[PDB]
DNA sequence: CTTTTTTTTT
């Protein structure tokens, strides 16, 4: 029988545990973000101090007061439903042990010497929250009497292979031997799990639908943990971030966390190791045949209607514009074939394609391959011409087929959340997005006749339930992604090809921004929360960015509260505690004589390790000094009298996989145990199985009732964060050794932490996934362009790291590369940081603490140089004795990452004008395409330099040392990866104000009015944001030139027209003067200088023009030049002859460089020649 | 030249 909530009405919700700095630090954060927000905004906040100060302690209080509010807010409303409270961390120990400390809590809190909740209030309270493990799990601890009812109650017993499955897993259950049969029992656990559920849902879904109460209920309840939170029995929920991202099971569906966060409140502890986590679900996503994909979108696009009920309003508009892109696109690339390749160098290897879909490009192909259409063979034939045509090529058909098939998934998550609001004002049971999502991707997909992209719609969905590559967006990394296309022959047939693509749409860091864009609070708990580095970390400058002032910050008043409590938690210095630190360098002649005394009828160490230890030639190398230091540190922690607790953080777990190598080292600590009269036990391959099998209790068990002293091996995977390694104290076995650093005591119980630790370097830094092939290459590629995006690379070294993976590169290479970057060194200072803070985790300490520490370490922590203050003890000492050596002359960051950013902005800027002047040359050409280009120019014009960081054109502007100006060499139809900018080069051409003659061109008469009237700038601000060379050379010194003609040519009583999308940029605009049935064009330039203006490209413009409108007059004006220079008549050869008989018209200025007069005989010609017409 | 373990569904 449920406790109810009625046994709440006598509580005093106003009395509260007096609240330490760090709830404050929760509280005054949040109450501030809902006075400057609104109520239903979602949050970030990052919390990122000392190991060791109590930081989950604090989350776990945070979420029983809001487990006390919420059953105060339902008291009181005695329909609202229940907020849902999330604890997410990596790992299943810190999951398990984070719910067994709240439950702790509950059950032993007090309040001024009495028990804060009686012992229903508490039945009720430990009622609330639940744990959501893997599904194999799950199954595997019901009883079989809860199975068996819930077998029964569904009448899912007579239903064959089922009771076959099932009777085989009790089975398996009954006779559980050694892990042996335990991998087994795991596998057909999750498998028929899977299957039950699956059929428990749709016999739920259907009308027969079985009523759930008394024994039924508590046995689903048991069986699926998440229909309690379904129900509204639970709100709470631990669980890893594997789950949340993939979701749990009701009787009803799958339910994602993530298509739900409005209102919820996520802890997510040690959140900067979530960023790998998210990434290796990011990458397990699908491949698809884009070939296939669009043929098949093309052929049920044609004719297919959706019905014109009330409930499908206005969801086929959504659709129209991509039904016309569908056609176009299937007429111009002749989509009624197949395709295939030809010709040699593409049979033997399958083609490789990859794109950021901006501005990265990188071809496996060594020369460049084309697309022709073969009407007589009716094939599409992947040919490599050995003679630029930019018609037909295979990256153009596979970026455009890209583009079209995430159209289509983003108008199916139009169309979903369009159909939720048509039914919303209809159907007036779940009626919220989540539980309409289902219902409406079946309608759409069914009534298109597209049901075989309904895996793809829920994937897309899956990464996507949280939500352009415009130059007038803001644009990233991070919520564009990366494309990898492979192009081979269809499996079975010798005559097709087929594009499988992989996607990544988005980087862990736009999920994060996502997830709080959709209204979640989340709070960032760790000790390296804002580490500088974008591979084991999110990008905390482009949340900045993002969030705004979404992303709460903490003042300093409270960051020094927080860190006065730390050192008066933690006074290390007045409690007389020493802590020495040693760095091991690699003694093989200590190994020698340990090897030689353990197998002592061998000559050489070399067979000992070749046949003993069982390690070949190629190691040996390696071995010999990893095994060497870690046994100069056990030898002087176990030399070491008053320690007793020691853990050596390796990278390799010890298991029985290296049982030989195990043997040696325990030969080698019982030769030391009986030197030094001591005791020891050693703890192998410490692991995440071994914590859930076994238990970190034992090591702390022998620590409280065993005299002697302990060994423990983990890695870096399992204990570097979050676990809490403590053992209860006895006074008898602990000596006088142990001392109290707390100025006023503050715990119940009395406990220690370790006091030695060895320290290895870890080594495999960059990230990498064993799911597939597919997925290294999606994570290798999306670290590569994480790097360029931060800065730390410049555009040439990625786009050379980006072919040399293409091309195949070695693991070791990959790693090569990555150790030249400081993005390495902080999270090499990142994993030593948290590793360390391992030791800190009590009051009462050893009066000395051993720290032993990889010497191949020291350098990396020479080169420290954040805030101190923040730093914990064992940090402040690493870091210090490291530095002892004195500083080494190391290059800034700000300035390489602001090179390299300069360098990524002119290249973004570069290709992406191309693809706009590409996409403007085309018949017919967009109405967006035509306003964004008007919008650069406009923007361009009116804000030359901005003074923040813009939000909007971010990729026109880079940021220079100096302010409104700066120096840069490189060709601007040339290589974008060999530009430099601001002091690499001393002599080069400028971008500056008076570079471009700004002053001189607006002391004209009518120049002012106009960019007034307009709101042009005429002056240059003076703010580091400065136009790239791209945008100043190509955009904005042409801009100013046709506004300064235009300004005195309507001066002159001229009427200007737009120009008609059909030859659109090819001219600048209309001429119109008195009437004349003829039409005028008009070209303008700034200034004379260089223009690839060739006789050709005149007679093409001719023709192009006179083509679909007749004849017409041309008049080619510059606007700055001499006065002085004649004016000048040309044909339309750009010939010189007779004005009778010349079509162009030739003005060198209008408005003079020396005195800005504008030019009235030009003007005068200009009317007589119309005149004449 | 570098030198692995971790969660989940399948
Ligand atoms: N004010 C407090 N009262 C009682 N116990 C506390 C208090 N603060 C912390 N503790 C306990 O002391 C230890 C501090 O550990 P946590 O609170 O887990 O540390 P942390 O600061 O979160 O560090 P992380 O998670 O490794 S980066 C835990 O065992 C807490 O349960
Ligand atoms: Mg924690």
Redesign the pocket.
Known sequence: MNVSIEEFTHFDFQLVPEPSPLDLVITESLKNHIEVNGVKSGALLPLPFQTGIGKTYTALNFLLQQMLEQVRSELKEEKKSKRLLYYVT????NVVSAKADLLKLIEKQTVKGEPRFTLEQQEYLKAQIVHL?????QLLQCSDAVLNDVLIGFNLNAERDVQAEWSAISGLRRHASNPEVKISLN?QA??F??NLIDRLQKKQKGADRVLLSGSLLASVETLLPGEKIRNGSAHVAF??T??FL?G?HNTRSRYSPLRDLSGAVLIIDEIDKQNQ?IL?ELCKQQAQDLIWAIRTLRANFRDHQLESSPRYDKIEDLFEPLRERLEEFGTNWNLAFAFNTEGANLNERPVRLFSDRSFTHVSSATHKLSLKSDFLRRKNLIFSDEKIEKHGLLTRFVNEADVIYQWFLGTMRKAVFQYWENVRGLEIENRSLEGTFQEAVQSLLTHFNLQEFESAVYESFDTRGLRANKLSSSKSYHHTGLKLVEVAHNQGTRDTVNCKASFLNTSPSGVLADMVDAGAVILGISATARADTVIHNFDFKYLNERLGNKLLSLSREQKQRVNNYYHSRRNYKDNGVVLTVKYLNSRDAFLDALLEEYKPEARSSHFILNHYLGIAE??Q??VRSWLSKLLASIKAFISSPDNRYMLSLL???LDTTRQNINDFIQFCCDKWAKEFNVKTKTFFGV???WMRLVGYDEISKHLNTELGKVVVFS?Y??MGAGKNPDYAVNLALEGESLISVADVTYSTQLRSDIDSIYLEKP??????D?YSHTANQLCQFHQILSLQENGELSPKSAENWCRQQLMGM?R??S??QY?QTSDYQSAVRKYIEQAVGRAGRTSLKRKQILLFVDSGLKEILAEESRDPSLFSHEYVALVNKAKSAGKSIVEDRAVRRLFNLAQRNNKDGMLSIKALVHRLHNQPASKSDIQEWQDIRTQLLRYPTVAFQPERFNRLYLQSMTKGYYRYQGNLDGDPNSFEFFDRVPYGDMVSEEDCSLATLVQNQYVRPWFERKGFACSWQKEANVMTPIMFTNIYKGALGEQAVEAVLTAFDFTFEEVPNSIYERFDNRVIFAGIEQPIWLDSKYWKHEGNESSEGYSSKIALVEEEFGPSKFIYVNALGDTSKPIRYLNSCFVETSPQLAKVIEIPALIDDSNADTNRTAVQELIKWLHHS
Do not use: C, I, M
Not at 133 to 137: C, G, V
Not at 763 to 768: D, K, N, R
């Open positions: 990596d790992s299943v120990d493990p893997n599904q194999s799990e596998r999750g498998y799990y899977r669980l890893t594997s789950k993939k749990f986590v290796s190629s190691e190398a390696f990278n390799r777990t692991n995440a199985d890695t995977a399992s080594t495999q830094l960059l990230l990498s064993d070695s070791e290479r790693l090569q150790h």
